[PDB]
Design a protein around this ligand. Structure first.
Ligand SMILES: [Ca+2]
Length: 277
């Protein structure tokens, strides 16, 4: 039988499902370690690999991308779990190898592929502590092209530091930097913090799909980000004329305020309020 992970309800995606909106005809690129397209609870429409050593984007040796993809769009059926936008068109853009890491050059090619193929939403549950002009250039190009780009703020908050721990490309203003809360809306101890933080989404003990047709729970801002990417798909399936700037402003401005924005951004996303008309 099918379960609904708590994070799906926490952001109020079921309200849109009840309205008949599930992300249909919205193209979502999962820029990550591939997606196990053979998983019975996922429908991957297409993809591309830019990892020289692993040319098949539909095999996920890390499990990272598959877990991310399930939070976005695990199918509504008799098994497994349920994504935020279970009707979204999913695309596997492999830029990380089986270790869950990749080079900025592979990521850039993935982003360019997303632009060239008219993706509506980019999920980047990845990042690093060092910037790259080539990275910022391609990310901005994507956003100027109309793409909603959601990026994990990072998992470097656990040891209090002076200054921002928000990683790249979440640090860039053009991207939505997403931090992690638990089911009580408490910031996760590991969630990066900084002035570049935009919103929070569930990122603790997130049950989602894993390669081999199985399921499991992970922690990280990498798990919160697909909640926001999925929310963007729901919104766009209801408001297909909205710009990526409108979609972002709605997600941020209608978020549930949780306190100091340095740690919480605008707060927890509320896709019901974001998409209300
Ligand atoms: Ca399912």
């Amino acid at each position: 039988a099918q379960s609904v992970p708590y994070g799906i309800s926490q952001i109020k995606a079921p309200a849109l499902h009840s309205q008949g909106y599930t992300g249909s005809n919205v193209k979502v690129a999962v820029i990550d370690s591939g997606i196990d397209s053979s998983h019975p609870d996922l429908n991957v429409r297409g993809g591309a690999s830019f990892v020289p050593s692993e040319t098949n984007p539909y095999q996920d040796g890390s499990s990272h991308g598959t877990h991310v993809a399930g939070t976005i769009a695990a199918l509504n059926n008799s098994i497994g779990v349920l994504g935020v936008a279970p009707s979204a068109s999913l695309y596997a853009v492999k830029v990380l190898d089986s270790t869950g890491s990749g080079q900025y050059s592979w990521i850039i090619n993935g982003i360019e592929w997303a632009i060239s193929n008219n993706m509506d939403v980019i999920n980047m549950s990845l990042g690093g502590p060092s910037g790259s002009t080539a990275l910022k250039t391609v990310v901005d190009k994507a956003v100027s092209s109309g793409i909603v780009v959601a990026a994990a703020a990072g998992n470097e908050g656990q040891h209090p530091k002076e200054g921002s721990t928000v990683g790249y490309p979440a640090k860039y203003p053009s991207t939505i930097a997403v931090g992690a809360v638990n089911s009580s809306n408490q910031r996760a101890s590991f969630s990066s913090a900084g002035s570049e933080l935009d919103v929070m989404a569930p990122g603790v003990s997130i049950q989602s799909t894993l390669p081999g047709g199985t399921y499991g729970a992970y922690n990280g801002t990498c798990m919160a980000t697909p909640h926001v990417a999925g929310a963007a798909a729901l919104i766009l399936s209801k408001h297909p004329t909205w710009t990526n700037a409108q979609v972002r402003d709605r997600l941020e401005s209608t978020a549930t305020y949780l306190g100091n924005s340095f740690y919480y951004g605008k707060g927890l996303i509320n896709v019901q309020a974001a998409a209300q008309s």
